[model samples]
Target: PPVIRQGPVNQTVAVDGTFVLSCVATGSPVPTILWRKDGVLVSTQDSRIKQLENGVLQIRYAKLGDTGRYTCIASTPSGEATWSAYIEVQAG
Candidate 1:
């Protein structure tokens, strides 16, 4: 079965800061990961965010808009696993 494991999801940030939300899927084969925020699809590899091979999601210059539930989904031929966490962005 596919399992979803994530690191610290809810993180506080200043006006201009950086944060990270990472997840890993353990199963027979390496699963594909897709990240979403508030039901909106976000880029896996974009200029604002970076997806690392170790399943780490990094956000540069965190903002108020970054406050939301981030969902990470991993899928394989057998099944799919999903995990999410709500983040709170605070001012410094």
Candidate 2:
């Protein structure tokens, strides 16, 4: 069974700031991390926003539009789990 050690936490940042939403879990096979925003799969190709190896969703130069509900999912052979938090970006 996979247990969530750390869950994604809500964040409030200023426009053009940088932030990271991380999820940590423990499992038999070492769970994999997946990130999503508002139920949409997050792309790792974008340089500004990316999912790190340790299930950290990093956002660089964040804008107002980037604020939303972010979900972090951890998966493994044992099972899968999810955690979500809302991001509020203040305007400059």
Candidate 3:
């Protein structure tokens, strides 16, 4: 099983600004980290969103409907699990 060692923390970023979230963990099998917005798997096909190594999720140009709880998925050879954390965006 995986244990969250450094999970993503809550954030507050202004609109059109860039934001970053990081989720880290450890386990018997060396957890592989993944991320999603709300309950759906985040698609990195968009230019505004990109995932980095060491469990970092970066989002640029914050916009409406982008405010929600981002989920971090930590998986191990043994099993997988999900964790929840949220963020707030300021719009002018």
Candidate 4:
């Protein structure tokens, strides 16, 4: 019985580099952070992302392919909250 919210509304990154897409939500039971890239599931252990202890999704070795709509999904007993943003990787 808690509410979820988004944190770090914006971010900037360089091409072929590291970037973290994050969303921090608070709930009675800590909400799970679900990350989606371009509307598809981006797995952390799949080698492209790492979920930090602080709940930030680290994009490893980012590239142009990694630039797109990213969404953070959180669920709680109250409901669900999703924070989304479009990442534009600067041409570095």
Predicted structure with the largest lDDT when compared to the true one: 2
Candidate 4 on 6-92: residue-level lDDT in tens? 653556778778777777788877787777778898874667678875458887777777778887778766677777888877784
Model 1 Cα lDDT, one tens digit per residue, 31-83: 88777889987776578788766467788877787888888878789898778
* lDDT values for all models: 0.77, 0.86, 0.84, 0.73
Give candidate 3 misplaced runs (Cα > 4 Å).
Answer: none
Question: Which regions of candidate 2 fall more than 4 Å away from where they truly are?
Answer: none
Q: What does candidate 2's lDDT look like per residue over 13-61, in tens digits?
A: 9999999888888988888888888899888689899766777888999
Model 3 residue 8 distance off true place after TM-score fit, in angstroms: 0.9
Error of 2 at 43 (Å): 0.7
Residue 18 in model 1: shift from native, Å? 0.8
lDDT of 3 by residue, 1-92 (tens): 78887777888888999988888787887788888787788886888898878588999999977899998899878888677788888787
- Candidate 3 — worst ten consecutive residues by lDDT sum? 76-85
Q: Alpha-carbon error at 12 in model 2, in Å?
A: 0.8
Please tell me which model should have the higher lDDT, number 1 or number 4: 1
Candidate 1 regions with alpha-carbon error over 4 angstroms? none
- Shift of residue 9 alpha carbon in model 4, Å: 3.4
Question: Candidate 4 deviates by what RMSD?
Answer: 2.2
Alpha-carbon shift of residue 17 in model 1 (angstroms): 0.8
RMSD in order of candidates: 1.9, 1.2, 1.4, 2.2
